[PDB]
Amino acid sequence: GDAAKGEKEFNKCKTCHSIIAPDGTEIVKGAKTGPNLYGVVGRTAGTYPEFKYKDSIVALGASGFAWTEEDIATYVKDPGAFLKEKLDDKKAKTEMAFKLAKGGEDVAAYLASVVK
Ligand code: HEM
């Protein structure tokens, strides 16, 4: 997708998320009520240290799942529907209460390029 446009679309994510490199460099200074999204491409779902996730997203990483750009793009359009489908569980719940109407792919490409 497009990284430069996804950078501008991350203005919907920064209200709960930041993007902080391991030495502390703040690539995006945002909030702290969602987890750090630096290196989230390729990382096991629900394992970022010192963050209390809801149980479904943890069970999703406990089965082997690591995020990809394409899964980020779909999850961000409707996080609770994503979780219900992958876990095959109607009761799957999510704490991320925000659905991105368009721009999933671009934000996803922007998150992969930020470590690079
Ligand atoms: C399009 C913008 C956003 C993107 C790209 C995004 C991306 C993500 C991703 C990729 C995860 C899973 C992280 C992991 O497994 O470590 C996540 C989790 C989460 N996000 Fe977002 N997020 C966005 C907007 C938001 C907003 C606006 C909020 C708050 C209103 C939010 C709150 C959270 C929370 C609380 C979690 C943990 C989910 C859980 O425990 O169920 N996110 N987000």
Q: Whose CA is nearest to atom 10 of ligand 1?
A: 72
Residue among 104, 113, 94 at smallest CA distance from 71 = 104
Q: What is the resolution of this structure in A?
A: 2.3
Distance 34 CA to ligand 1 centre (A): 6
Which distant-in-sequence residues (6+ apart) come within 8 Å of 27 by Cβ?
19, 20, 21, 38, 114
10 is in an annotated binding site: no
Atom from ligand 1 closest to the CA of residue 9: 1
The total number of structural domains that make up the chain: 1
Atom from ligand 1 closest to the CA of residue 104: 1
Solved by what technique?
A: X-ray
List the domain range (segments joined by +) for residue 58: 1-116
Q: What is the CATH number of the domain that holds 8?
A: 1.10.760.10
Distance 115 CA to ligand 1 centre (A): 18
Report the distance separating Cα 111 and Cα 72, nearest Å. 9
What tokens were used for 70? 């394409």
Q: CB 33: neighbour CB atoms within 10 A?
A: 11
